[PDB]
Amino acid sequence: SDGDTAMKAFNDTFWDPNAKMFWKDSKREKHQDFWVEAELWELVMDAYQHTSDPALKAELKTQIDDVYDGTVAKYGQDWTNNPFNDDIMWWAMGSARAYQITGNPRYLEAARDHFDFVYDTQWDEEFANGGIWWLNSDHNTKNACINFPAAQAALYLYDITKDEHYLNAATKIFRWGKTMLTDGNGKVFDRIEIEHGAVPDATHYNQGTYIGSAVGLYKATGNAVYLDDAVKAAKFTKNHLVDSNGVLNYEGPNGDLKGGKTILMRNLAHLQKTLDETGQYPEFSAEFDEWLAFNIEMAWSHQNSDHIVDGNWAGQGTYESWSSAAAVQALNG
Numbered sequence: 029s030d031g032d033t034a035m036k037a038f039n040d041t042f043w044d045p046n047a048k049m050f051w052k053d054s055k056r057e058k059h060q061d062f063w064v065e066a067e068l069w070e071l072v073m074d075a076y077q078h079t080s081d082p083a084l085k086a087e088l089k090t091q092i093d094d095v096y097d098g099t100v101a102k103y104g105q106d107w108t109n110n111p112f113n114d115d116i117m118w119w120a121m122g123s124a125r126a127y128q129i130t131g132n133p134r135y136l137e138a139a140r141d142h143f144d145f146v147y148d149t150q151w152d153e154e155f156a157n158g159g160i161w162w163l164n165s166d167h168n169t170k171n172a173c174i175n176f177p178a179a180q181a182a183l184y185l186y187d188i189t190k191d192e193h194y195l196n197a198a199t200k201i202f203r204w205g206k207t208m209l210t211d212g213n214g215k216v217f218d219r220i221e222i223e224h225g226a227v228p229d230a231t232h233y234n235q236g237t238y239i240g241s242a243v244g245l246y247k248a249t250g251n252a253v254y255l256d257d258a259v260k261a262a263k264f265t266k267n268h269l270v271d272s273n274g275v276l277n278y279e280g281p282n283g284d285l286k287g288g289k290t291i292l293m294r295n296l297a298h299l300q301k302t303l304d305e306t307g308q309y310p311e312f313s314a315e316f317d318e319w320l321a322f323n324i325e326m327a328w329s330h331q332n333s334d335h336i337v338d339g340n341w342a343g344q345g346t347y348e349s350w351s352s353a354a355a356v357q358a359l360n361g
């Protein structure tokens with residue numbers, strides 16, 4: 029019931045049924061940024077999968093379609109005019125998931141066409157021995173926030189199509205990213221910049237997409253090293269991207285990072301599910317489950333009277349949909 033209450037409250041506060049988009053904040057003066065809207069789309073899908081209330085489930089299923097329609101009305105169906113390859117890939121990944129839920133052809137086309145544009149034209153072997161460029165305008169940096177989401181999108185497309193092309197892509201992208209965008213012990217680097225090298229700044233959302241791609245690769249390949257990869261990145265997050273009480277950091281003031289716990293929590297749930305299913309890493313699993321539950325309880329203890337939780341989970345006017353999404357995500361694992 030907590031997940032249902034949280035999602036209903038989030039919609040009541042932030043969903044605009046007229047534009048079929050989320051508001052960026054509770055002043056209701058501007059709709060959410062394009063890339064973040066794909067992440068709120070996935071939140072709707074996660075609540076759809078989590079709920080056991082058939083009436084709410086049907087409403088959320090409809091909302092999956094309405095989110096796409098509202099975005100396409102403002103931004104079009106062809107996102108390849110957007111210079112941000114990551115923006116495109118977040119929508120390609122969301123579209124693959126929407127296809128799995130709904131069966132509507134438009135979503136498979138959207139996923140496959142946009143994945144192909146990025147992977148087939150924005151992969152480069154010369155700089156840094158591999159990796160996808162951040163932008164399709166200028167080619168100066170290759171980033172975790174495009175590469176790991178691309179591996180995830182490829183894994184969804186493999187699951188849908190069974191075409192080994194997509195598994196091969198996920199494997200190649202992840203191998204490059206593990207080698208060039210991590211320290212080999214679970215710390216995920218932000219990016220590798222031409223003429224400079226690695227920028228080893230770690231953030232919640234890049235830990236998340238690394239973990240999710242690793243768990244997906246473990247499941248698709250049967251290679252246990254990928255599960256180990258995921259566990260090491262989860263451990264790094266729990267020990268090194270938290271405050272002194274173990275509560276996940278607040279990553280403001282940057283607007284893109286403020287809500288990153290949303291993406292982290294989505295992917296930590298994948299890891300929790302796989303550990304529960306396989307019985308692997310039982311010691312870590314117990315520690316991890318306790319730490320997750322603690323974070324969730326602390327976050328929700330700061331909910332306001334409308335059942336909205338700001339993204340500064342360690343503490344207590346205007347609430348923002350991206351920063352507030354993480355607490356909702358956490359109850360819809």
Ligand SMILES: OC[C@H]1O[C@H](OC[C@H]2CNC[C@@H](O)[C@@H]2O)[C@@H](O)[C@@H](O)[C@@H]1O
Binds near residue numbers: 171284
């Ligand atoms: O420092 C945060 C963030 O900044 C830049 O990306 C911003 C967004 C652009 N497109 C949508 C999201 O994927 C990004 O967060 C990049 O420098 C990025 O690597 C970095 O984490």
